[PDB]
Amino acid sequence: ASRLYTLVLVLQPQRVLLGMKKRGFGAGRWNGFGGKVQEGETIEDGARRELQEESGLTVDALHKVGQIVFEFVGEPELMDVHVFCTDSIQGTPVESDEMRPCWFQLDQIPFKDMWPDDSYWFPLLLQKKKFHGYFKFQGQDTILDYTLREVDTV
Template structure:
């Protein structure tokens, strides 16, 4: 497939998707995010370095070439928390746009209710359990408060968030769906 065809159709090419909008062309990079949930609590990680440093988040990262989205989710969870999971439930997909950046982030969000191992700090993340009524939304990405409750309620969703910088949401859409 030629790159030109990928641009016109929005298809994947070399683990990236290409989209053409009037006046602009965006590439989309694939990411994963895993939330480990147990009755009355959720495991989050304090991001220690890189994009989103200083914020609590789920565990995840970039999908590598030749890797499926679910394989990437499992790998990132293990690398960042020391945990493995038997089952991942795909809960949602959100596209993020950051003003001034021509690369969109397509994040595939998973939920894991069972895991193996003990949460262990890594170079990138410091894991900590939070009671569901004490989730630190004020120290998380601004969009989390919109979709995070859907994951906890086991509702499937798709969304789009446009950010100015890392703190300000300029616009967003979020809808529950039958399948992701």
């Protein structure tokens, strides 16, 4: 019992784009752009669609970088998050009622204001490593247990 989600990081040589979510699940945290995958849509097509919806940016080629499964204790459905990166975008990041994008220098990534799992796998993303992860949360702040391993094929 898992549900597909996407997460996209626009990662350029000296900066990364994050978005501050204004409402719903994850509100108040910086994160990549993503969401649920639709019926009849490929995971990558869903990732591209969500990037546009939430940031205003058009991506063509997305690179698979990771898969992270999230368990929230007391919730039956696991979240199967497919993580992608891109360095080539078109458009200017757009702030909306749902999302405030901002560029960050790589030495200023706002980990204290991100989901806590990001502190484990974001350093792999920055060094161009691919990974498979599993994080068991209690609520939205506490990691009870986790696994995270580098892989050659996502």
